[PDB]
Symmetry: C3
Subunit: 337 residues, 3 copies
Amino acid sequence: ATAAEIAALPRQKVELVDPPFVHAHSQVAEGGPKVVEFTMVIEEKKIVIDDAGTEVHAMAFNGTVPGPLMVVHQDDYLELTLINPETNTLMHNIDFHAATGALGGGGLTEINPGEKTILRFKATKPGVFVYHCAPPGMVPWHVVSGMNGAIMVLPREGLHDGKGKALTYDKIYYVGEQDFYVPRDENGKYKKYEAPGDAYEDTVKVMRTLTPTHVVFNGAVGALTGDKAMTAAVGEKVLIVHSQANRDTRPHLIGGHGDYVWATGKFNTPPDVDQETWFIPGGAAGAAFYTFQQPGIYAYVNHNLIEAFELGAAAHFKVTGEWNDDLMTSVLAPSGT
Amino acid sequence: ATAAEIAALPRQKVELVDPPFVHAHSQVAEGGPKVVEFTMVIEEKKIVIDDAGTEVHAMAFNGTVPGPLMVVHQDDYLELTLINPETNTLMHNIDFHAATGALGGGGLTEINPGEKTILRFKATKPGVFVYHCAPPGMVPWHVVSGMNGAIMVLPREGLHDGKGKALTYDKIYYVGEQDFYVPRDENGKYKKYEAPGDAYEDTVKVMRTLTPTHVVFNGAVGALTGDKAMTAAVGEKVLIVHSQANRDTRPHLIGGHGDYVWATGKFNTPPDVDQETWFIPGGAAGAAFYTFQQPGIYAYVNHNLIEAFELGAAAHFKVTGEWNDDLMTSVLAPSG
Amino acid sequence: ATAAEIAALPRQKVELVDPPFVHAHSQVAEGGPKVVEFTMVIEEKKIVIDDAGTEVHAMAFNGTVPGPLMVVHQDDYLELTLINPETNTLMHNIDFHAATGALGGGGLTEINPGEKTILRFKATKPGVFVYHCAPPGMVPWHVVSGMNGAIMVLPREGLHDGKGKALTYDKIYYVGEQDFYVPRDENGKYKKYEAPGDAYEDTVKVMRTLTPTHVVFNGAVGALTGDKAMTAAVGEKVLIVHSQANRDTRPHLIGGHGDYVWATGKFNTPPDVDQETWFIPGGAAGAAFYTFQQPGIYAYVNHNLIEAFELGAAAHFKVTGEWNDDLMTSVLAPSG
Ligand SMILES: O=N[O-]
Ligand SMILES: [Cu+2]
Ligand SMILES: [Cu+2]
Ligand SMILES: [Cu+2]
Ligand SMILES: [Cu+]
Ligand SMILES: [Cu+]
Ligand SMILES: [Cu+]
């Protein structure tokens, strides 16, 4: 398309919502290509990542870890206004794995505190894709400080299974998984720091062990539990988008399955089916579609169970509806032999 | 099906066999849906896992690490009687990844020592699937103490390739891979404990390093080597089911291939073909189909070779038959 | 085929080239099956792997880490003359994951210093495959000393997508990724040794932590950058072959994609498409096909960004051509 033709396209401004929720969108594209406009302000902020009060100096797109999910359709243009407020201390940028050129956009979006930039790219390939900050020489430090999220580029005709049958979800959640590397003192207690820069050297030492201290969804241990548990109902079709910008994960819905899983995250690659546990390599997003069949509490985990239950990578679903004894029944409840 | 229809299905009791062997079954389903009944007794016991006398307080379905492979067909029911003898000291349960609801069955099967339970679930999806104990708040500890196994839910018409051609194995083995995290004292010597709970805190410390001290098949270093090597013959078709309930693995048959590999373990997902090394993520089972073409000793490994040859994740196959010089020949033997 | 049939086949001698370049070959097979002849001399040599002067005692096929890429076509025979010069100190061999029998050839190729051997195998399965040394009892040590490479067995009709459309590359590069385990002294300084055997005990200790000190392409931090940046132009189709003989990796072309990725490395397994980041398990090779659409510098990385940018797993592409503002444009350049 020419500059003139792109200029002639409809514009749509989107208001982002905080994960695990996803902004209003249509599964099947409404009309022809558009320039879909997003704005995000980067916040360097102290966050608490567990119930003990362990702090991280997060580097957060839109003030959240993960950054929010942006949704467009194939061959739309995503136009992001990225703002680095003067209250921040570091240069930041953005690399969209969905985009083509200039290191995903990073080469064109290097912004110092007090600066902004506007990047447009054509979303040529359908799928869920990681985005993350990547300042040359400081790349993993920004990413493992939480400066990453994902986008979804839906096919214009919405989702389909591997064999051309339409798949329409009732709801969608975005689970961003974060590996954190928090320095410890000689007693093994987590250290606190005044400014982000003060933590750098100690943090790099931990990073180099390739062993995170915390592995979390939505920025903290237990973030998606209690009144923040995800919800569904028997019969409800749910898409769960999962990303990990730095490190492998292996998602699993305890008590359920991934009926269709685009484990590579790319919609032109046919989904795996009937999955127990799927695999998303570091630097990617994936997506799983499931129709709930049983009510009750589910845990959604990274199925390295140490990572899930010791390090933090467990979320909950609360599911309403009628129990199905055909699918599962307690023939004899726990009772004396 | 209706209530009366479910109640009217035949019930069949099947006797289990210790891994890597698999109980007798038919690849193509015999008759209509059945309620297939299994019983397992949980054993808490000390096992030695290496050549240095290193002990683990194993928590073992049916007395083995891994627990045995249960085989049913799609749309059968699996009905397990799980027994926790009063001589045990921990509560246990079971989560079948093959099952739908109540955390895979874990929510319905929490049995204290001296208790038993019977769980039935419909095996709605074909594939190999992990099962494991998962007492809330102590999940990974039970799993990495060896309390895990797998099941196979065969398609009612048996296995097929990506094009619909039948794939019929002559034999099947179940390799359960176990990551262990054994505490050491400050001199590097592995510690021993009187009771399982005594090891809890020290073990969780090792677990949190995400670095197993041992990675083993069938519960110990060298368990599937030497006189306990698996066997085959040239021309024989072998299915190798492999599980890892907690941690990634990358199986490889040294000297062979995975001709067809359901790497995700699910039979409705078409198998990869001609595989050198396949990948099974922690929390899953996979299955590889191979026709042996050469005789001799094979090694079957997790192809992180440090895990295989330093930490214990190596098995052998002993294969009989005639050497095929077309496939491979020594044109010049090692010579000065 | 019979011995007589094989003896009648055309022979072709190949001259290997150092990675990431690949020796001259045809994508579509030229004529019927051939016996394709290769020779490699093993060099035990010191390599410097980072800008701190850190040394590894490399065990290098053809003097490089990784060893060179050998290219044949399906149902060709690969005939390798492998030489262990008297200047070396250890026994070596070679295991081809592409091969069938005798542990991939390792059982037939054990050569002491001063010995040579000739192995012929039939390349029956199309794909990219790891090869590596594997001396019994010292396997991971040789592999993590850099004694590994890969081969490509092309389909006789060259590459195709999942739907039979031809895929023809203009350029091919071979990236061998290496995990190294370098001992450190009490001050955290990397240790140096004056013979490979001297380093064994200390190196095994590091290996057992499963935590590499370095993860590198082509034997060193920054190897495939600057003078060794890989090159292309807008419109050019490039195949990137990537191997890792011991440890998982997750390749990613920063600024680009894998348009078609044989993530398992096997050409009869249909390629994934539009990949951001693909996954290659330890013990395997994979291949990605991409058509460049934008000029400029790309980084090609293992997308565990700590592994890429702290441990060394980062390469560059330098791509010439015209910028495409339709695909990407700076609407507002960084400004107050
Ligand atoms: O599927 N329970 O980890
Ligand atoms: Cu990236
Ligand atoms: Cu589980
Ligand atoms: Cu190998
Ligand atoms: Cu940043
Ligand atoms: Cu248990
Ligand atoms: Cu060697």
